[PDB]
Amino acid sequence: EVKLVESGGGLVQPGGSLKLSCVGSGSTFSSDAVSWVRQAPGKGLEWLAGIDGDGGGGSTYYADSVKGRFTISRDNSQKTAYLQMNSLRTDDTARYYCAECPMVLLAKCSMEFWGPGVEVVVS
Amino acid sequence: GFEYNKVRPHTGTPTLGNKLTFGIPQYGDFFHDMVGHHILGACHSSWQDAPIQGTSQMGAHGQLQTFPRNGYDWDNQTPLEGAVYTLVDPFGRPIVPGTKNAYRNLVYYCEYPGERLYENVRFDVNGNSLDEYSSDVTTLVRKFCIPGDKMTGYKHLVGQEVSVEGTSGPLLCNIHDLLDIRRNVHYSCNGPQTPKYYQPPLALWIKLRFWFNENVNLAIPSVSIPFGERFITIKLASQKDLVNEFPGLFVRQSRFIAGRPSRRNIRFKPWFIPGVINEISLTNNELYINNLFVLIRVHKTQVTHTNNNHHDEKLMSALKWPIEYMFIGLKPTWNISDQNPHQHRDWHKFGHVVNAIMQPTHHAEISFQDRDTALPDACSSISDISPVTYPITLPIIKNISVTAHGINLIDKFPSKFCSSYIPFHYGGNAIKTPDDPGAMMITFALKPREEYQPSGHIFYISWDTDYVGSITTADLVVSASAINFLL
Amino acid sequence: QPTHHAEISFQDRDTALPDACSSISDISPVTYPITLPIIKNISVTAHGINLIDKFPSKFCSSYIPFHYGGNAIKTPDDPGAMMITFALKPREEYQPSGH
Amino acid sequence: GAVYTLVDPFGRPIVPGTKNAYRNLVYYCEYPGERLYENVRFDVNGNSLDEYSSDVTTLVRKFCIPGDKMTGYKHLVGQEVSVEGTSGPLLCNIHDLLDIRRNVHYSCNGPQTPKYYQPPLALWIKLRFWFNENVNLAIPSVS
Amino acid sequence: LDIRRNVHYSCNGPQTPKYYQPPLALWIKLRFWFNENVNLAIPSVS
Amino acid sequence: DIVLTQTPRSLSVSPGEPASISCRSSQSLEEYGKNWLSWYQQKPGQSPRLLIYQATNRASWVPERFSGSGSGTDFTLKISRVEAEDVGVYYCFQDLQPPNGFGAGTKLELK
């Protein structure tokens, strides 16, 4: 069964940077597009970033609110995806999920497999 | 002496699926053979967008096409571990999904598209059709009457590809007797039947068959009736009955099977959404006629449709003229049905054609270390993009019987007996023995073609089959030559 | 060029692309001599008559052997080998009907 | 990454700089029997009754020979004839909308196959004149 | 630069080794002095 | 870019009664002949879970009470009979082109 594990969020001062890992066990994680999605407390879900799988390219797509501030990556040798937050502000405290579309390109993919997510608090 | 002349089409602007009228002028006393010349225009499929993954789109012939998600089987359910699906060209080139105007389907003509083209040839003399024939009797006289020595040129006349022979390099072989250099011989085709992105304009030279085409001495006089009275009406095939599309996109799955040995299996399945082919522009539509400057054998044909299960018998009374031989062809209606994905390959085939699929797979076994060498450490199993397809033509008839009125004549003869022994033993040098089990030959009166002298003369076609009934029917085609007297 | 291809993965974590590939060709390739026509139109112009006048090469080379000559004349496989008939049937009997 | 070595045409390594290391593979022409007789002439104190070349021989090969008598003619002019062989039994899946089939391969062995040592080749080249068509058209030898 | 299709050949008959050979219908001709022509048939009344 | 507006925010529907969720797009969400809106359901205390993909299809776990929205620019999820396990938050998600967006988020709670 395809599983995802996020790690991890914690107490971060309003000036800093975080490196969130998302480890997947689904036997096709290297060919599966990975999205990073935000749920702020007292607010609905908010899409943040997306990255393609191997085959065709490695293009990254970004939300306009966090474009340039964020840096998405993936290392398929350990079946991990990476989210780098740089200079995150006080409204960035939220529950963060990595979602694994069972599809290569992240253009119109459906976020099928999710993980428990990690709660990132900014203080 | 003799010369040749051209006839312009009387209809004006020929279009596929529409009747063409040709008018015979007055230029001599005798004219027997004639050839319709056409130059079918270049064709190509429309540009099509690459599909998104995880989408199933409705394909041709009621067969759904699908681009599965990763970790699933072909049907986008019942998950298959390690399956990864991408898009490739038919020659292995990657295609990015979601791209606008990403690929074209590969247009390919029919096998023998020239015989398929002239769907209904009729010789009218103010109505009163002297001879009306179709594509099926032309296929019958191809499988029987053409000697086979003059086949490749005939294959050039009707636009059929001819196999070209090539050779590899020198190779070492060991000779066992109870060390030698040999070259492998390969064959490859190039014609319109090979799927191409851009088909060139195909030149078709189609012969017309009547009672006077057999011999030069049987040409009817043109002075008995005026030249402003004879017309030739050709109803052509549709644009969908001549060119078909081949998949210009293939869903490629790579499946990783872990453990020992660790296998990488690469397989392919076509993605075939029907595109649009541009209209075929008929060009240089001429009718070459030989003019000679100074009783008969008529193809009395009738093709009928039969739907009864496991046995059938028909009713007919039209044939009254004496005959000499009797050519039979049984074709399931699924051969020419538009729901058949292989109907362009099998429209001419007299029999039930199943498909045999060779899947040539490259295999390799690699060991990364020299301690545990019992099993390979990794294996590669790569299939070709398109497999090798053999059309295997199995018979439909188990027993044939042409029941006459007072005599039974042919009664429950086996299909193989007729179809093989009768062409082999009768007909002289003219009759080639067909390769199709449903192409049958039966004799009634005398030897079929050796001399111009009848030694004697004199018909409900019936059969017992193992083929299905109302699910898939069967049609009968005849090219029996009747002896007619003109007075 | 008949080429053997193989795709080998040394490991089971990153199996999206093969770890190694082999593409081995044969020493000598497979060569097909494709014989394309050179003539677009043929014409044997006589003195008072034109006789053959701009017939297409395929028309002659394919239809004339197919229709004329009886069983003796094999139809050639080469487009540049054309056949043209002037007087009568080529080989059926020992009697001239005209020249 | 390009690395260049020398190999024999059957895959055997050849060391560069070796004296007398390899031989070219001699092979005959296709139809050397027709190629051999480049100019056939029938002289009667000069006054050539028939003079013909290889080109008309190729023309009458492609047209006049019935084609049933190919292999023997291909044996007469020293042309290789393809020999058919078969592989083992192989599994196939029959699709109708599970079977045992054997592949059929073809391979040649004659002079046109490049060999290190061509054996002595016997050519039986026919002569074409006006009297070769029928037995009744033979010219008298007493005139 | 060109599009070509490979042509392969394969057999299916009794000479192909199979686990289970189907029943084979053999039709064997008989050769005598009268089989060459229809006019050379011997009378059956003599 | 494309902004998805959820007209219902809270319904307070009785158990066993149908419920309706509306989501409107800025322009057409349709490309290659299929709609590209998804519906996601988040139960209290659980991660988000795909409920409907391509605006008319459903996941394997989905029981036979979730309607396949509509077509064009306006879509409406309909639940025939709320079974007290459907209490949660529903989202309409853009799947046309990146950057993809989520809806306002409608909270369904029984009454």
Residue numbers in the entry:
A (entry chain I): 1 to 123
B (entry chain B): 71 to 248, 304 to 419, 435 to 598, 606 to 634
C (entry chain C): 499 to 597
D (entry chain C): 152 to 248, 304 to 349
E (entry chain A): 304 to 349
F (entry chain F): 1 to 111
Which text from the study accompanies this structure?
The outer icosahedral capsid is built from 8280 major capsid proteins (p72) and 60 penton proteins (H240R), organized into 12 pentasymmetrons and 20 trisymmetrons. Three copies of p72 and five H240R molecules constitute a pseudo-hexameric capsomer and a pentameric capsomer, respectively. p72 is one of the major protective antigens since monoclonal antibodies were shown to neutralize virulent ASFV isolates. All four classes of antibodies recognize conformational epitopes that comprise 2–3 copies of p72 monomers, locating on these exposed regions (ERs).
To define the epitopes of antibodies and expound the characteristics and the neutralization mechanism of the antibodies via structural analysis, we determined cryo-EM reconstructions of five antibodies (B1, F11, C9, H3, G6) in complex with p72 at resolutions of 2.75 Å, 2.98 Å, 3.48 Å, 3.24 Å and 4.36 Å, respectively. Except for G6, all other antibodies have three copies of Fabs bound to one p72 capsomer, where three B1 and F11 bind on the triangular exterior of the p72 capsomer, constructing three vertexes of the “triangle”; three copies of C9 and H3 associate with the triangular interior surrounding the three-fold axis, occupying three sides of the “triangle”. By analyzing the antigen–antibody interactions, the epitopes for antibodies from classes I and II, represented by B1 and F11, are largely overlapped, containing 11–13 residues, primarily located on the ER1 (residues 122–124, 127, 139–142, 157, 166–167) and its adjacent ER4 (residues 511–513) from another p72 monomer. Compared to C9, B1 and F11 exhibit a ~10° clockwise rotation, whilst G6 shows a ~30° counterclockwise rotation upon binding to p72 capsomer. Class I antibodies exhibited the highest binding affinities up to 2 nM and classes III and IV showed nearly 1000-fold decreased binding capabilities. We found numerous clashes between antibodies (B1, F11, C9 and H3) on adjacent p72s in trisymmetron and zipper, and also a few clashes in pentasymmetron and zipper. These four antibodies have potentials to cause the dissociation of the capsid as a result of the mechanical forces generated by steric clashes.
